[PDB]
Each structure stands twice: as C-alpha cells, then as structure tokens.
Amino acid sequence: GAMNSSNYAELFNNDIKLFVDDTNVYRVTVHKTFEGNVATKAINGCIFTLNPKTGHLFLKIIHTSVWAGQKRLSQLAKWKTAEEVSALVRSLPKEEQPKQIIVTRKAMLDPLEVHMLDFPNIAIRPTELRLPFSAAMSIDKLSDVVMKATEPQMVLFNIYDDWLDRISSYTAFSRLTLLLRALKTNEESAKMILLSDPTITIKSYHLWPSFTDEQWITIESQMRDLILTEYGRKYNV
Amino acid sequence: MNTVPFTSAPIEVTIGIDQYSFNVKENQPFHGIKDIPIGHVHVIHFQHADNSSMRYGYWFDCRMGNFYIQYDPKDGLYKMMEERDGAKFENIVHNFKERQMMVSYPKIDEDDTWYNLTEFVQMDKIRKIVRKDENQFSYVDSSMTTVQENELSDPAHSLNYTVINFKSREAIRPGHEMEDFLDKSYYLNTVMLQGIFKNSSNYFGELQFAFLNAMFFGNYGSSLQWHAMIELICSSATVPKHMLDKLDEILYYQIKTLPEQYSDILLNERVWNICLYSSFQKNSLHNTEKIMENKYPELL
Ligand SMILES: CCNC(=O)CN(CC)c1ccnc(C)n1
Numbered sequence: 001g002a003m004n005s006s007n008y009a010e011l012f013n014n015d016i017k018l019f020v021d022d023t024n025v026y027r028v029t030v031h032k033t034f035e036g037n038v039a040t041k042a043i044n045g046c047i048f049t050l051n052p053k054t055g056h057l058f059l060k061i062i063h064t065s066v067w068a069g070q071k072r073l074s075q076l077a078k079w080k081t082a083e084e085v086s087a088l089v090r091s092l093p094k095e096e097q098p099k100q101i102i103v104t105r106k107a108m109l110d111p112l113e114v115h116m117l118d119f120p121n122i123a124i125r126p127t128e129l130r131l132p133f134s135a136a137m138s139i140d141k142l143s144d145v146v147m148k149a150t151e152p153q154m155v156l157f158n159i160y161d162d163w164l165d166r167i168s169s170y171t172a173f174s175r176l177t178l179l180l181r182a183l184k185t186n187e188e189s190a191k192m193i194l195l196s197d198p199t200i201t202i203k204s205y206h207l208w209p210s211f212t213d214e215q216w217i218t219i220e221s222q223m224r225d226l227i228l229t230e231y232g233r234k235y236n237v
Numbered sequence: 238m239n240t241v242p243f244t245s246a247p248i249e250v251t252i253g254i255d256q257y258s259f260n261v262k263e264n265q266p267f268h269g270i271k272d273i274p275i276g277h278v279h280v281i282h283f284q285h286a287d288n289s290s291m292r293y294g295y296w297f298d299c300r301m302g303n304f305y306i307q308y309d310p311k312d313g314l315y316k317m318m319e320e321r322d323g324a325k326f327e328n329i330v331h332n333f334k335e336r337q338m339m340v341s342y343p344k345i346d347e348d349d350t351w352y353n354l355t356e357f358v359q360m361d362k363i364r365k366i367v368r369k370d371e372n373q374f375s376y377v378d379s380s381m382t383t384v385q386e387n388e389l390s391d392p393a394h395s396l397n398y399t400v401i402n403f404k405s406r407e408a409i410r411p412g413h414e415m416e417d418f419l420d421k422s423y424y425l426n427t428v429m430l431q432g433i434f435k436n437s438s439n440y441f442g443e444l445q446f447a448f449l450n451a452m453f454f455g456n457y458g459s460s461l462q463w464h465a466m467i468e469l470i471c472s473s474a475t476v477p478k479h480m481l482d483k484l485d486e487i488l489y490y491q492i493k494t495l496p497e498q499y500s501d502i503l504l505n506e507r508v509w510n511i512c513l514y515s516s517f518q519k520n521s522l523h524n525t526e527k528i529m530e531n532k533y534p535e536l537l
Pocket residue numbers: 016017018051054056092096097098
C-alpha cells in the first residue's frame with residue numbers, strides 16, 4: 001500500500017527501492033505576448049529518482065525539445081517520467097532493478113504502473129509523506145547541469161556526498177529532507193545558512209559543504225529555526 | 238408459443254420469467270408457464286420464501302428442446318430438466334393447460350422490452366460462458382464468480398466472461414503506453430472486436446447477458462463485466478458509428494428496466510459519470526444520458 005509515518009523505516013532496509021518525484025519534469029516561465037496575451041516558455045527539467053538507502057540520484061534531464069509540438073504537456077510529463085523510469089529499470093541487471101518504486105504524487109501511479117507492466121514483481125507505491133523533493137533545483141550544482149543541458153542526458157549524483165561514512169542512511173535521509181524542506185520554505189535564508197562561513201567549502205565532487213559532525217548539528221538546528229520561523233511569519237504566531 | 242411445465246411447487250417461491258414474476262405459495266397447484274414467445278432466449282429464476290439468499294435460475298431456448306421444472310428435495314432447489322420423450326411431453330402439457338394450472342407469459346403486444354434486452358444474446362454463446370455442456374440450458378445464481386474473479390475457486394461453476402483489463406499487456410502496446418491507455422480504440426477494435434469477439438453483435442451479446450445476470454441474480458461479477466464492456470467503448474476515441482448508436486439503444490432499455498430501488502448496487506457512479514460526461518463518447522449516448530439524468534440524477 002501507501003508509505004507513511006508508520007512504515008518509515010522500510011526505506012532503509014535492504015530491498016533496493018527508489019523514490020520518483022516528477023515535480024520538476026515540466027517547467028515553464030509565463031510571459032506576456034506582444035498582443036498582450038499570455039504564453040508559456042518551457043525550460044529544461046529533470047526527473048528526481050533517488051535510491052534513499054545509498055543516496056544514489058539518477059538525475060534524468062528533460063530537454064525542452066521533448067515538448068516540441070506536443071499537446072497537453074502536464075499530462076505527457078507524467079508519462080514521459082514513467083517512460084524514463086521504466087527505461088532505467090530495463091537498462092539495469094536484474095539484481096540491480098528496484099523491488100519497489102515510490103512515487104511522490106498519486107498522479108504518477110497509473111503512468112508508471114502501465115509503463116512497468118513488464119515488471120509485475122516491482123511494486124509501485126504512493127506515499128502520504130509531504131517530501132520536499134521539488135526543492136532539488138535549489139541545489140546549485142543540480143540546477144546548473146539541468147539548465148546547461150543541450151540534449152537529453154542522465155547524470156548520476158550522490159545526494160549524500162560522503163555522509164554515509166559517518167552517519168546512517170536513516171540519519172542521512174533525515175538531514176536531506178530537512179535541508180530540502182528549508183530550501184523550499186525560504187531559499188534565500190536556507191542558502192545564507194549553508195554558505196555563511198567561507199572557510200567551509202563544497203568540494204568540487206559534492207553538492208553540500210564539508211561540515212564536521214559538530215558543524216552539521218548547528219546547521220541542522222539553524223534550519224529547524226528557519227522552518228519554525230517561516231511558519232510564524234506565514235501564519236502570524 | 239412454448240411451455241415450461243412444472244412437476245409441482247412444493248415450497249413457497251417467487252418465480253421469475255424474463256422480466257415478469259409472481260408468487261407461488263407452498264403446495265399451491267402450480268404446473269408451470271405457458272405462451273412463452275419462441276424466438277428469444279429466456280430466463281426462469283427463483284427466490285425461495287424462506288431464504289431470500291441465493292437467487293438462481295436457468296437460461297434457455299425453447300427451440301433447443303422440451304424443458305420442465307421439478308423440485309429436488311435432496312438438493313433443495315427447482316431444477317431444470319429436459320424431457321426427451323416428446324409424446325410424453327406434449328401429453329403432460331396438454332393436461333395441465335386443460336386444467337388451466339399454468340400462468341401465461343404476459344406479453345403486451347406493444348412491448349418490445351424483452352426483445353430489446355436480448356437482441357444480441359444467443360444461447361450458443363451463453364453455453365460458452367456457463368460451461369455445462371450435458372444440458373442445453375444454463376444455470377446461474379447470485380454467488381457464482383467470474384474467471385477473472387478467480388484470478389484475483391471452483392472452475393466448473395464459473396462465469397467465463399471475456400477478460401477485460403485496462404492495465405494489462407493485452408490492452409497496451411509497447412511504445413503506445415500513454416496512447417493506448419488514454420484511448421482504448423486499439424484494445425476495443427483490434428484486440429477485442431477483431432480478435433476475440435469477431436463482430437459487434439457477439440460483444441453486445443456478452444454485454445447484455447452480463448447485465449441480465451446482474452439484475453436478475455445480483456451477480457456481482459456480471460455487474461463488473463457489464464460496466465467494463467461499457468467503459469471500454471466509452472473510452473475509445475474511434476468507435477464505428479453504428480456501434481455507438483446501438484450501444485445507446487441497448488443501455489437505454491437496461492436503464493429503463495432496472496428496478497428503481499436497486500440503482501445503488503448495480504450502477505457504478507464512476508463508470509457512468511465518466512462515460513456520460515468525460516469520455517470520448519460523452520456526446521454519443523443521447524437516449525441513455527436523457528433517461529439516466531431524469532431517473533437517477535442522484536448518481537450524477
Ligand atoms: C536503480 C536502482 N538500483 C540501485 O539503486 C542500486 N545502486 C546500487 C548502489 C546503484 C548504484 C549505481 N548504479 C546503479 C545503477 N545502481
């Protein structure tokens with residue numbers, strides 16, 4: 001069935017699974033036309049596919065050429081996502097495919113189910129969690145590779161950098177969701193927090209700064225402050 | 238005009254003949270049903286006074302033999318049987334008619350309801366859905382399951398309807414996943430019509446037979462089958478114009494005939510609202526939509 005608070009620890013067992021988020025597959029700017037009407041201009045997007053146990057991010061870039069001459073693009077984006085996820089499973093050795101795939105929006109269930117009819121032993125699940133993965137385009141290096149793409153492309157990241165050397169997957173996932181929740185709630189402040197100390201750098205091969213354990217605990221505390229705060233400023237409390 | 242004689246009526250029962258029904262009291266002198274129009278299939282069905290559980294009955298065609306009903310006190314039901322001795326049969330029927338112990342199939346001459354509900358239903362196809370080839374008639378009841386239901390447990394007593402599944406490899410061509418899922422014309426026209434049913438009459442025939450088993454027996458698998466065959470058409474952008482026009486006639490008479498008070502269990506809100514209001518054919522079922530909206534607007 002669905003994924004929720006009660007079975008949250010299944011994400012870090014030893015059955016290979018992915019999360020698929022489709023919220024940045026079809027992205028547009030909305031502008032006025034000379035005639036004073038409105039038109040959209042698509043920009044590159046990405047499929048956020050994430051192995052939560054290892055941190056593997058199989059980032060599929062969706063080049064704008066894929067929408068050319070297509071109608072009903074919000075609907076096709078769902079099927080395009082399913083088609084690419086399916087292509088990835090199929091590319092992979094049997095022992096390497098996902099036993100489950102969790103979709104972050106229910107509208108993905110039917111597209112992915114239909115694209116995966118060949119894999120009846122892969123379970124396609126929704127979740128009741130409000131995961132902040134839409135904020136993945138606030139990670140500068142991810143946004144950069146998407147926007148520079150001139151063609152369809154798959155780039156493989158580890159969204160945990162080297163964190164699993166020191167902390168568990170459970171803890172690494174929780175750090176990631178907190179960072180992403182913060183970026184989603186107030187991207188400027190979130191980013192001020194992460195880069196306030198020029199001595200702490202992001203290695204060329206990482207997404208996040210090289211914080212010590214003690215420095216992560218402070219960062220993590222500052223991000224919770226941010227999220228609590230924006231909640232007041234928003235609701236007046 | 239043909240006759241189904243009854244040996245006796247030892248237990249109080251509600252008897253159905255097509256869309257008609259009447260009460261027989263325990264050991265009332267009842268010897269069967271006469272003036273049955275030749276040329277259509279028919280269904281004679283039963284609901285015991287004592288156990289309104291398990292409606293049950295027999296599909297049959299009087300051209301295919303002489304059939305009578307006889308209560309079995311061992312198995313506890315009204316059983317259809319064939320009389321092979323034809324002189325015995327004529328003689329038995331003549332006596333019962335002379336003594337006027339038969340009710341008359343009560344057809345009004347303006348009334349084409351039964352013909353309109355059974356236009357494409359053929360006894361030879363009923364016998365492939367309901368497998369029991371030693372009899373020419375076919376038993377159905379409330380609790381029989383469908384072949385598809387057994388895939389999701391006794392196969393001899395199953396309803397072998399045509400399996401329809403929108404999320405199956407049969408329904409979806411590789412590379413046309415979105416196209417085939419959002420527009421089922423390929424599944425309808427090539428897979429089902431051209432491939433399985435051969436023509437639209439065989440398809441409509443199963444669809445009608447599914448609806449009747451749902452109405453008369455509350456057979457839940459039959460109901461699912463009816464709705465599925467409707468939805469497959471309604472979810473195809475490309476349907477021959479003649480098929481839509483007959484579909485509209487077919488549904489109209491099914492909706493007209495449904496008990497007003499059974500509407501909540503035999504009609505799937507999702508399928509009907511989708512078919513009448515969201516589907517490719519939302520503009521194509523004028524008669525069906527008008528009767529649906531004037532009779533069951535609650536459902537919509
Ligand atoms: C795609 C679902 N499979 C995995 O996640 C397994 N996972 C092992 C760490 C990796 C890592 C690298 N490449 C691939 C392809 N898989």
